[PDB]
Amino acid sequence: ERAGPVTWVMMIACVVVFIAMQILGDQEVMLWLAWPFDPTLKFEFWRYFTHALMHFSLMHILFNLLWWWYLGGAVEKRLGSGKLIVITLISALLSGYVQQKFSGPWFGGLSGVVYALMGYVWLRGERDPQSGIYLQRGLIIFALIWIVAGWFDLFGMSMANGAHIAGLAVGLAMAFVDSL
């Protein structure tokens, strides 16, 4: 059993962008993929989503992709590619929106999406056991440690706590709906 298409394409896209960032520098890549940072860019629609493809350190991309691989992979396998796509698009948009509102357009990474997937997988398994999806008891602990690491700034994750709560809200909301 291997990761499905959406899980895989996202991971490779993040690695490619990360490489581009090491070669050209973070600033040059953000210039092209960051949330619109000037009126002149408000209609370059890819920017409302591409911010999620940029990571600023090895630990940042390492842990984001591990969680995405595990959670996103599980969602895609058991619920389908369509499900992962919607959770991803919505959480990326909302967390990106909240982040820029309070901290500006210079940010990036899948942490908002990971918070969404954590909330979704955990809640879906708690309310809808026979759905087949759930967050392994032991992994809940390390998810909490990862959450705490970002919350108290012990680990730089680009995005602020408010943005992460927005991503989490999306996952919980969708899990609630799916267990309805």
User: Which of the stretches 8-16, 51-59, 89-97, 142-150 binds ligand BNG when contact is defined by CB under 6 A?
Assistant: 142-150
156/166 Cα distance (integer angstroms): 18
* DSSP type of residue 110: S
**How many residues lie near ligand BNG (CB under 6 A)?**
27
Q: Is residue 89 a contact residue for ligand BNG (CB under 6 A)?
A: no
Near ligand BNG by CB under 6 A: residue from 48, 69, 97, 155: 69
Near ligand BNG by CB under 6 A: residue from 18, 35, 122, 134: 122
Closer to ligand BNG by Cβ: residue 25 or 82? 82
Q: Is residue 2 a contact residue for ligand BNG (CB under 6 A)?
A: yes
* 55 classed as catalytic: no
* 60 classed as catalytic: no
User: Which of the stretches 16-24, 33-41, 72-80, 83-91 binds ligand BNG when contact is defined by CB under 6 A?
Assistant: 72-80
* DSSP type of residue 129: G
Report whether 77 contacts 1 (CB < 8 A).
Answer: yes
Report whether 159 contacts 54 (CB < 8 A).
Answer: no
Q: Is residue 118 a contact residue for ligand BNG (CB under 6 A)?
A: yes
35: exposed, middle or buried (Cβ count in 10 Å: 0-12, 13-18, 19+):
buried
10/172 Cα distance (integer angstroms): 22
118/124 Cα distance (integer angstroms): 10
Q: Is residue 81 a contact residue for ligand BNG (CB under 6 A)?
A: no
146/144 Cα distance (integer angstroms): 5
The candidate with the shortest Cα–Cα distance to 87, out of 33, 30, 149, 133, is: 133
| Residue in 91, 95, 111, 158 annotated catalytic | 111
Residues in 5-44 at the binding interface with ligand BNG, rule: CB under 6 A: none
Q: Which residues form the interface with ligand BNG (CB under 6 A)?
A: 1-3, 66-67, 69-70, 73-74, 77, 102-103, 118-119, 122, 126, 136, 139-140, 142-144, 160-163, 165
Provide the annotated active-site residues.
Answer: 111, 164
